[PDB]
Design a binder for these strands. Structure first.
Ligand SMILES: Nc1nc2c(ncn2[C@@H]2O[C@H](COP(=O)(O)OP(=O)(O)OP(=O)(O)O)[C@@H](O)[C@H]2O)c(=O)[nH]1
Ligand SMILES: [Mg+2]
Ligand SMILES: [Mg+2]
Ligand SMILES: [Zn+2]
Lengths: 37, 158, 263, 85, 8, 94, 104, 1111, 83
DNA sequence: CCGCATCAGAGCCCAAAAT
DNA sequence: ATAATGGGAGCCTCTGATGCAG
């Protein structure tokens, strides 16, 4: 989001999880393939 | 920028493309009742023909816009990315296209009408199955995704 | 065991589960002292186990214990701890909060990217403790207690109180949230601009990150209280400092709809 | 049988009122008033006493009672805590 | 498995 | 955007450390009534009321602005924590 | 001191009793006339604490000058009513019973 | 104005009575107007006949009767009473031992009556019972998913009237039977019916390996009695297999016409499917001492013949609307009635085994408490009994025609998946494909089609016209789905000359599959396009031009239209808006021919031909369930001559008898400076000035004064420590005076309550001593106006105890009700929508001088952004606007039917005629073309809109036929650089209004156990900061903000108290402490006998209870 | 060993994390037998206790950072540079 | 030793919440 | 406080992990 080296302390897993989940809605394999993986 | 009904421009190329599709469709019928092709083969050929005719009419819609009416509102919104995409615009000025049975297999008969021309009650009903199926798909997905995301947060949170 | 409004009593299911247990234990103590046969003592003992079982985890083994003339299984300790409605996922990993509000959102083209429209009536409640202190520092009321008494009746509110509120919120931000919060931008910080009217005004560029429309969406408002919270919000959570997607790295606040159309 | 324990004789009196009203309602083709029950119960009974007896006989209700379709709402959740300042 | 049936 | 936010991110190794420095500085100012500020009378943030111009009450605004000047020193293990408190309350009472 | 760790472990019957402020001997809840808790019942103040802050049940000792005294007449400790959220009771079973979590 | 109707379709029959599914269903169940001897055995009668006689002594049923209601409907609504009739039953006691006969009429309680419009009044609130779709009873055969060449036969009876049966054929070759989830070989049960090896061989055998695979020798080694004991040991282990006990179990489960009920539809479906005729509703009989089979062998016969591939055997599609039936109000209530009757019978058998076998009458033997509770339970807690939707007349009419697959006896919201939610081919003409909820319930709740009716068996039928040869008769046939599949059905719009089919090729359906067919093959024809859609969908003009997903929103939102004081019918209608007002019953009509004698605001008196002077009172400002004002206004004048069925008064949201859900406004389609962004809407201040989109709303407030153990609550004008300013508008008794403006904080009803033992702390005692005022005995509990509410006090109702007609719940002295009304002008945040699914919130109200305007000075009303059209694909609004333009200048309204409508050329003809009025006026008034009109015309020919080389008049008319006009920006005066689409659109103000939704809280009520803020606006709740919100704060790394949410702003008690004190003292908020809901968690784990210990770095315990929990 | 996200989540050292996810009783019974200690390493644990999470302004890297003005650093410094 | 089966676990967020 | 009275009434779908079984 800042297009620059990440700051120590950024809660990165949560950001990873939100990034993967947010598009989930709009997936038409489809989302089942993602879950299979 | 506005939208009137005359802003959905039926391309002249449409009538031509439709006449071409019917002679092709007749040739596939002769090969069925004469036993040249199976029931499986005939249906597969009909869907394929109509897929190509749809694509044909789309390009015609966008060519007619670009060359003869480049500031048309539908065209402008779609091209700039303000709103619209080709498949929605194709349904406004073109044909609606192939619709799906409640199962998953596609109807052989397409909707030749556009929202500007208007559908027939029978065409309208044929289309509803896919509409409903889409809504149910979406409803069960938001739940599946929601659960997925929660699993993901829990595994990476530390 | 609480008396509700009407003088009626409302009570937790645990009390009925304990009462069942207590009775069977007491009867068992009595049957032992009175030297009943082993078949009778055995039935009492097995009933005692089942009563313990319902208290700790009802429905886990055997028929769920129910209140008479209801199909509703009584709510045992396991049910209290676990599930969507359980203690963890309801009161522990998330809570209802003070200093929060909600309204319908409306587009505010005139806003700078870091601003929002906030109904004045909402702002007075959210900052109510701050407004009381400021009403004492200047002079609208003799002390804190009288100031609160004046806001209770809406007609007792004079016009100087609105200017008083403006002084309070200077430089501070509030949090806007629109559910569902799918990624970290479901919440952003804004400097509030007081408005007449009952609607929240949202900046056009952020509608995408929020997936907001004007087809009737509502948003929630939150007030960070401490200097620490306010600092976190203005630096880390401010809309203007988050312009790019943390997912793709691409611009998030970007032209759309009319803006593209005009250019 | 009761979350709030009742003296054995008092339960018996209440049950008498039940039977009585049930008779009274079966002859009258409608619910009796407190006065119709107070008369039917004999001397010592006025309408005021019939009401007080019923107030005592009211059983508490579960805080976990569901409200609505979705099984995601409890009655206890709508009750403020008046004790703590 | 049924406490009444066992007792009967 | 907060004024000169890009330069502020410049001064630190981690964006969250900026927030910590700012927040702590703003608390120092509030407790001591601003009289420990490194700003000068014409640099003081101002707020426009109906009466007229007054000092910006918001200490977080103050703290970021002070930081931009350079007159503040930030780091870890610079001085025992309690000793600072006594020296500041000695220099700038409450 | 500050909390750095949270341990969870099994509780001996001795320890269950180490928590307990009394045995609940009766299924009674509160008295149908007075609406006060029944002695030795699930709400008994002699076990779990006073209903009103620094005030005993029968009202011999009503304020905070005494905190920790246990009234001889009614038996209730004079402390904050908040303790009714904290102090545990216990029931002494005649025959032992298995904890279903460790069975099922 | 003139009304021009388009369309060539002649509809041979009118729409059926729209609430008939409700009215007719309940009338069929009660038969109250039927003389008892003439009652058919159905509904209530059938329920009684089923439960009796009750054997030991025999108590037998004679007949029932229904009394008249104790109180009328208005009275019931007033007093929070149920509208109901007393039910009595004549019973005769017989003695099988003696000969004794005592007969008496016992009172069974009350039964709720349905009103004229098809709804109920239950405890003062109006309610609707929603019909339930479910699987029809019968015998079905579906393919077995596991084995691709085998099948399962399922025998399904009416719900709760028997078990589900499965006839799977196991891999070993023997045919297995599944009952109550337990399996055994079916041959054993066959032996119990008295079947022999010969019968199975001779009947079936034709199937070489299958009939022989069922044969098991060990079972035959025993007569029918021995085989029965053998099976019983399989089903009930540990129960002694006593011969009378085994018979009892098997009889009650299979043959008992009391414990096992196939439907009446089940009987027909079974008889029709298996080609047999059933003597009753049971799977078997007990006759001449043994069991005699009815169903089982034919079901086995059909299964084996199917496995082989014998002609005439098919699998059944379970979503076909022939195998799916509707359970209407009568049936739903009657099922619950049957339950209550069976419980009462339990009491009878138990009372006939106690107190003396002689001195008993029927009145002492019967306790009606179980029956009343079952009926009261259904009508107040069923999930088919819903709060009436009466936002506007269409709301309730639609509510009554809704169909739910949910509820008691149907899917759960979790227990449901695609096959059921789909739109089935058989839905055509029966269930609307459009009107369904969006979201989780999609496809489960639907709406009855307009021409559909439910037959006596519970199947939906739809009308078609017979076609013989090529001639279309006028005879209409209502068909079930199975019967429809037999014929070839032509479309309703297929060309006709006279009564003759005029086309060489017609568009038809055979089993839903579209096919082109010659007129010789045409057996039937659709009655109308209307028959395919619900009532709401049928109200959308130009529906053939709208994408379905948006059409759905159009339907659903008409339900939400708020009644407007100025409400008007749309300028473009479909022709159904007349029928809806009439069937809704909101509007008032004349009984016979006559003359109007009197016309008032409160009443209308009519003198008919009969001479009778019928007086019709009008309902004025009544508050509906949703708080919209139901109010009727007089439409006739003194002396007006009326015929039979002519309109007398308009209901709410009706204008001269046509449905008015909104207003007709002049709209311009164009972006406006970003106030149009993402569906928001810009409106002219002129709308408020002329009170368009203004609606009346009433909220009801209630308070009880009750007896307490501390003394009586009293409703009084004397309230401690309040100034006279604070009481001015209160009457003598403490009630606010009628006709006062009340605002938030104001007292509605004054009330005092006796102070608890909190009898003032010594701190308050010393203060009170200083001012020399005794602390009062009572405290101020007065009812006040909630934040954000208020209006004008229009009514007060006061009910005490000891006043005629009133007794409150025990302990309650008196109840006071205050009705407060408000006139709501449209404002920023209120929500608008049209019939095509364009919906949006009001983002800007411009003064008239900023509004874009026509050259002749008329400003537009609403400015809608065109960006909503192309992605949404709802074009009816565009054609609606154009025809709306013509009608604006020609002064006309239109009826354009769905799918047979106004078409493009015809709209063009009308638009030209309009231009003459818009322009010819100008040329005669002495004005020529404007300078700016030329500038726009320049830009228009660059767009290819007008043909180059024509006069300005010719070019403007060319644009006007495209529905575009020249528009001047009111800010600049300069024209819009292009011609803009402008016309009249029908737009409604929906029920979602900011005034209701705006909410905020600093601190407030907390929950008992958790000490977290309560929820919801009515409780002054806090917002829920949930699991996902915490993630957001976490990803930002805002630790102190998050911690505030977790402590000071919620259940950290020391912290939240301390933080408030700091803000009011101007200090900063303190560092938080342990949240109280964590302490709750710790103690809860201790209650589970688990030791939870907080430890320091030295692994020593930390006490978070600060010594309070340790002895 | 490769395990999916759900099982992986249930296996974390922190018993407060696992029991608040899913399989609450199972997680809690195995934890209680073991006499398990949650070290409060991750986010969910601290969220439940209402602590300052170990990220952002709560990370130990930035948590202890000090601010002092030059007008005070030199003032404090001169008095202490002596005996 | 390998399959089957049986049981027990999960199944989006917020607001309304018309009792 | 004493005729005699003797065995009960009742009802979706996915994936994953543990115990009997050719
Ligand atoms: N989880 C959840 N979210 C919902 C639900 N209903 C509505 N939403 C929200 O509503 C929004 C719908 O946005 P849309 O108008 O369809 O956005 P779009 O993709 O631009 O559609 P168009 O405006 O036609 O282009 C979603 O982004 C969701 O955040 C629901 O039932 N569950
Ligand atoms: Mg939206
Ligand atoms: Mg959108
Ligand atoms: Zn005492």
């Amino acid at each position: 989001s800042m297009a620059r080296p990440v700051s120590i302390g950024e809660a990165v897993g949560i950001v990873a999880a939100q990034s993967i989940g947010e598009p989930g809605t709009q997936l038409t394999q489809g989302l089942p393939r993602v879950i299979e993986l | 920028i506005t939208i009137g009904i005359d802003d959905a421009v039926i391309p002249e190329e449409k009538k031509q493309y439709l006449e071409e599709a019917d002679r092709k469709l007749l040739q596939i019928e002769q090969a069925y009742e004469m036993g040249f092709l199976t029931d499986r083969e005939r249906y597969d050929q009909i869907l394929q023909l109509w897929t190509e005719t749809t694509e044909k009419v789309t390009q015609a819609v966008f060519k007619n816009f670009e060359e003869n009416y480049p500031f048309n509102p539908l065209y402008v919104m779609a091209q700039s990315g303000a709103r619209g995409n080709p498949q929605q615009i194709r349904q406004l000025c073109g044909l609606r296209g192939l619709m799906q049975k409640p199962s998953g297999e596609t109807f052989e008969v397409p909707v030749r009408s556009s929202f500007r021309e208007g559908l027939t009650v029978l065409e309208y009903f044929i289309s509803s199955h896919g509409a409903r199926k889409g809504g149910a798909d979406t409803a069960l997905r938001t739940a599946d995704s929601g659960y997925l995301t929660r699993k993901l947060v829990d595994v990476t949170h530390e | 065991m609480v008396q509700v409004d009407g003088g009626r009593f409302a009570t937790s299911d645990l009390n009925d589960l304990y009462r069942r247990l207590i009775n069977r234990n007491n009867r068992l103590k009595k049957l032992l002292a009175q030297g009943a046969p082993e078949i009778i003592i055995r039935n009492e003992k097995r009933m005692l186990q089942e009563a313990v079982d319902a208290l700790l985890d009802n429905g886990r083994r055997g028929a769920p214990v129910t209140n008479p003339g209801s199909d509703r299984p009584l709510r045992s300790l396991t049910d209290i701890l676990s599930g969507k409605q359980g203690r963890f996922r309801q009161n522990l990993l998330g809570k209802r909060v003070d200093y929060s509000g909600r309204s319908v959102i409306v587009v505010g083209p005139q806003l700078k990217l870091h601003q929002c429209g906030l109904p004045k009536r909402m702002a007075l409640e959210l900052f109510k403790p701050f407004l009381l202190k400021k009403m004492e520092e200047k002079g609208i009321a003799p002390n804190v207690k009288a100031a609160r008494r004046m806001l209770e009746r809406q007609r007792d509110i004079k016009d100087e109180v609105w200017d008083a509120l403006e002084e309070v919120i200077h430089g501070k931000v509030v949090l806007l949230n629109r559910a569902p919060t799918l990624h970290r931008l479901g919440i952003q910080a804004f400097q509030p601009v007081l408005v007449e009217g009952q609607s929240i005004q949202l900046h056009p560029l952020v509608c995408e990150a929020f997936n907001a429309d004007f087809d009737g969406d509502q948003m929630a408002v939150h007030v960070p209280l401490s200097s620490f919270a306010q600092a976190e919000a203005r630096i880390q959570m401010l809309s203007a400092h988050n312009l790019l997607s943390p997912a793709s790295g691409e611009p998030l606040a970007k032209p759309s709809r009319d803006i593209i159309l005009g250019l | 049988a009761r979350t709030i324990r009742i003296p054995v004789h008092m339960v018996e009196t209440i049950n008498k009122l039940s039977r009585t009203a049930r008779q009274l309602q079966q002859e009258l083709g409608r619910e009796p008033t407190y006065e119709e029950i107070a008369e039917a119960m004999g001397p010592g009974w006025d309408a005021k006493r019939v009401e007080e007896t019923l107030k005592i006989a009211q059983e508490p209700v579960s805080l976990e009672t569901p409200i609505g379709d979705e099984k995601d709402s409890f009655y206890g959740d709508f009750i403020p805590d008046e004790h703590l300042p | 498995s049924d406490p009444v049936r066992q007792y009967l | 955007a907060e004024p000169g936010i890009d330069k502020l991110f410049g001064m630190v190794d981690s964006k969250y450390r900026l927030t910590v420095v700012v927040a702590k500085r703003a608390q120092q100012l509030l407790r001591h009534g601003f009289k420990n500020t490194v700003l000068e009378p014409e640099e003081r943030p101002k707020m426009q009321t109906l009466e007229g111009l007054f000092d910006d009450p918001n200490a977080v605004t103050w703290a970021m602005k002070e930081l931009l000047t350079g007159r503040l020193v930030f780091g870890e293990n610079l001085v025992p924590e309690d000793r600072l408190q006594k020296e500041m309350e000695r220099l700038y009472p409450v | 001191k500050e909390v750095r760790k949270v341990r969870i472990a099994l509780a001996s019957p001795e320890k269950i009793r180490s928590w307990s402020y009394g045995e609940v001997e009766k299924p009674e809840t509160i008295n149908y006339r007075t609406l006060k808790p029944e002695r030795d019942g699930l709400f008994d103040e002699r076990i779990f604490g006073p209903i009103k802050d620094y005030e005993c049940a029968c009202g011999k000792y009503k304020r905070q000058r005494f905190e920790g005294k246990v009234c001889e007449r009614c038996g209730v400790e004079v402390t904050k009513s908040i303790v009714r959220r904290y102090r545990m009771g216990h029931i002494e079973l005649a025959t032992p019973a298995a904890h279903i979590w460790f069975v099922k | 104005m003139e009304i021009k109707r388009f369309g060539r379709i002649r509809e041979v029959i009118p729409l059926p009575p729209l609430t008939e599914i409700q009215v007719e269903s309940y009338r069929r169940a009660l038969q109250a107007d039927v003389p008892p001897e003439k009652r058919e055995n159905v509904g209530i009668q059938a329920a009684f006949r089923e439960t009796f006689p009750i054997e030991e002594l025999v108590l037998d049923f004679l007949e029932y009767r229904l009394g008249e209601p104790p109180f009328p409907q208005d009275e019931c609504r007033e007093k929070d009473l149920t509208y109901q009739a007393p039910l009595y039953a004549r019973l005769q006691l017989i003695h099988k031992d003696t000969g004794l006969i005592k007969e008496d009429e016992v009172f069974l309680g009350h039964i709720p009556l349905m009103t004229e419009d098809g709804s109920f009044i239950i405890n003062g609130a109006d309610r609707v019972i929603v019909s339930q779709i479910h699987r029809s009873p019968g015998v079905y055969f579906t393919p077995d998913p596991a084995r691709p060449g085998r099948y399962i036969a399922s025998i399904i009876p009416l719900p709760k009237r028997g078990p589900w049966i499965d006839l799977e054929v196991e891999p070993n070759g023997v045919v297995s039977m599944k009952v109550n989830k337990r399996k055994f070989p079916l041959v054993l049960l066959l032996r119990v019916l008295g079947y022999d090896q010969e019968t199975l061989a001779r009947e079936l055998g034709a199937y070489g390996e299958l009939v022989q695979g069922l044969m098991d020798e060990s079972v035959f080694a025993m007569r029918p009695e021995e085989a029965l004991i053998r099976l019983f040991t399989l089903l009930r282990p540990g129960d002694p297999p006593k011969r009378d006990k085994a018979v009892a179990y098997v009889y009650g489960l299979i043959a008992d016409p009391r414990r096992y009920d196939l439907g009446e539809a089940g009987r027909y479906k079974a008889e029709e499917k298996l080609g047999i005729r059933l003597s009753g509703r049971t799977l078997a009989r007990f006759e001449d001492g043994e069991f005699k089979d009815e169903v089982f062998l034919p079901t086995l016969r059909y299964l084996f013949a199917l496995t082989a591939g014998v002609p005439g055997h098919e699998v059944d599609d379970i979503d076909h609307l022939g195998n799916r039936r509707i359970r209407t109000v009568g049936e739903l209530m009657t099922d619950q009635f049957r339950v209550g009757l069976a419980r009462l019978a339990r009491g009878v058998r138990e009372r006939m085994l106690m107190g003396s076998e002689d001195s008993l009458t029927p009145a002492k033997l019967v306790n009606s408490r179980p029956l009343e509770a079952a009926i009261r339970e259904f009508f107040s807690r069923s999930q088919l009994s819903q709060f009436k939707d009466e936002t506007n007349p269409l709301s309730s009419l639609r509510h009554k025609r809704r169909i739910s697959a949910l509820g008691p006896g149907g899917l759960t919201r979790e227990r449901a998946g695609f096959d059921v939610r789909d739109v089935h081919r058989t839905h055509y003409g029966r269930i609307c494909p459009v009107e369904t909820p969006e979201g989780a319930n999609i496809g489960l709740i639907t709406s009855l089609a307009a021409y559909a009716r439910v037959d006596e068996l519970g199947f939906i039928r739809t009308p078609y016209r017979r076609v013989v040869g090529g001639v279309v008769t006028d005879e209409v046939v209502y068909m079930t789905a199975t019967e429809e599949d037999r014929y070839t059905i032509a479309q309703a719009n297929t060309p006709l000359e006279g009564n003759r089919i005029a086309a060489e090729r017609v568009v038809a359906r055979r089993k839903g599959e579209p096919v082109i067919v010659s007129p010789e093959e045409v057996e039937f024809m659709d009655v109308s396009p209307k028959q395919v859609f619900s009532v709401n969908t049928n109200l959308i003009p130009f529906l053939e031009h709208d994408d379905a997903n948006r059409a759905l929103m159009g339907s659903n939102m008409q339900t939400q239209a708020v009644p407007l004081i100025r409400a008007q019918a749309p300028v473009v209608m479909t022709g159904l808006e007349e029928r809806v007002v009439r069937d809704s019953l909101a509007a008032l009509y004349a009984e016979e021919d006559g003359e109007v004698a009197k016309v008032d605001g409160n009443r209308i008196v009519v003198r008919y031909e009969d001479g009778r002077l019928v007086e019709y009172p009008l309902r004025r400002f009544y508050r509906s369930n949703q708080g919209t004002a139901l109010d009727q206004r007089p439409r006739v004048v003194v002396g007006q001559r009326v015929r039979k069925g002519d309109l007398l008064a308009d209901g709410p949201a009706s204008e001269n008898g046509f449905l008015a859900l909104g207003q007709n406004v002049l709209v311009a389609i164009m972006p406006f400076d970003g106030y149009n962004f993402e569906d928001a809407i810009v409106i002219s201040e002129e709308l408020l000035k002329r009170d368009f989109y203004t609606s009346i709303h009433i909220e009801r407030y209630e308070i009880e004064a009750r007896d307490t153990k501390l003394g009586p609550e009293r409703i009084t004008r004397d309230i401690p420590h309040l100034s006279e300013a604070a009481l001015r508008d209160l009457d003598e008794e403490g009630v606010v005076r009628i006709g006062a403006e009340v605002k938030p904080g104001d007292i509605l009803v004054g009330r005092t309550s006796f102070k608890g033992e909190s009898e003032p702390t010594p701190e308050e005692r010393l203060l009170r001593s200083i001012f020399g005022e005794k602390a009062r005995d009572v405290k101020d509990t007065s009812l006040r106006v909630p934040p954000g509410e208020g209006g004008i006090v229009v009514r007060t109702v006061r009910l005490r105890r000891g006043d005629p007609g009133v007794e409150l719940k025990p302990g309650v002295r008196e109840v006071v009700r205050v009705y407060v009304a408000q006139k709501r002008k449209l404002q920023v945040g209120d929500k608008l929508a049209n019939r095509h699914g364009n919906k949006g919130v009001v983002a800007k109200i411009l003064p008239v001088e900023d509004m874009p305007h026509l050259p002749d000075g008329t400003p537009v009303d609403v400015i809608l952004n065109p960006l909503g059209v192309p992605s949404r694909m709802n074009l009816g609004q565009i054609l609606e606007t154009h025809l709306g333009l013509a009608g604006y200048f020609l002064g006309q309204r239109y009826i354009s039917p769905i799918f047979d409508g106004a078409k493009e050329p015809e709209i063009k003809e009308l638009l030209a005629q309009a231009f003459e009025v818009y322009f010819g006026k100008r040329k005669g008034e002495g004005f020529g073309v404007d300078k700016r009109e030329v500038e726009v015309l320049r830009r228009a020919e660059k767009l290819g809109l007008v043909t180059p080389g024509k006069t300005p008049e010719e070019q403007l008319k060319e644009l006007f036929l495209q529905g575009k006009v020249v528009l001047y920006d009111g800010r600049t005066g300069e024209p819009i650089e292009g011609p803009i689409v402008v016309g009249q659109m029908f737009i409604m103000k929906l029920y979602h209004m900011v005034e209701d939704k705006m909410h905020a809280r600093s601190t407030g009520p907390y929950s008992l156990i958790t000490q977290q803020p309560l929820g919801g606006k009515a409780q002054f709740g806090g917002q829920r900061f949930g699991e996902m919100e915490v993630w957001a704060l976490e990803a930002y790394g805002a630790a102190h903000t998050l911690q505030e949410m977790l402590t000071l702003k919620s259940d950290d008690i020391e912290g939240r108290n301390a933080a408030y004190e700091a803000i009011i003292k101007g200090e900063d908020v303190p560092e938080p402490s342990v949240p109280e809901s964590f302490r709750v968690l710790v103690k809860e784990l201790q209650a589970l006998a688990l030791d939870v210990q907080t430890l320091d770095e030295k692994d020593n315990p930390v006490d978070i209870f600060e010594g309070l929990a340790s002895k | 060993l490769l395990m999916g996200v759900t099982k992986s989540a249930l296996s974390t050292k922190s018993w407060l994390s696992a029991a608040s996810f899913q399989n609450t009783t199972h997680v809690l019974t195995e934890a209680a037998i073991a006499g398990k200690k949650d070290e409060l390493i991750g986010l969910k644990e601290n969220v439940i206790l209402g602590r300052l999470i170990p990220a952002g302004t709560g990370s130990d890297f930035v948590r202890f950072t000090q601010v002092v003005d030059q007008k005070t650093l030199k003032a404090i410094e001169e008095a202490r540079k002596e005996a």
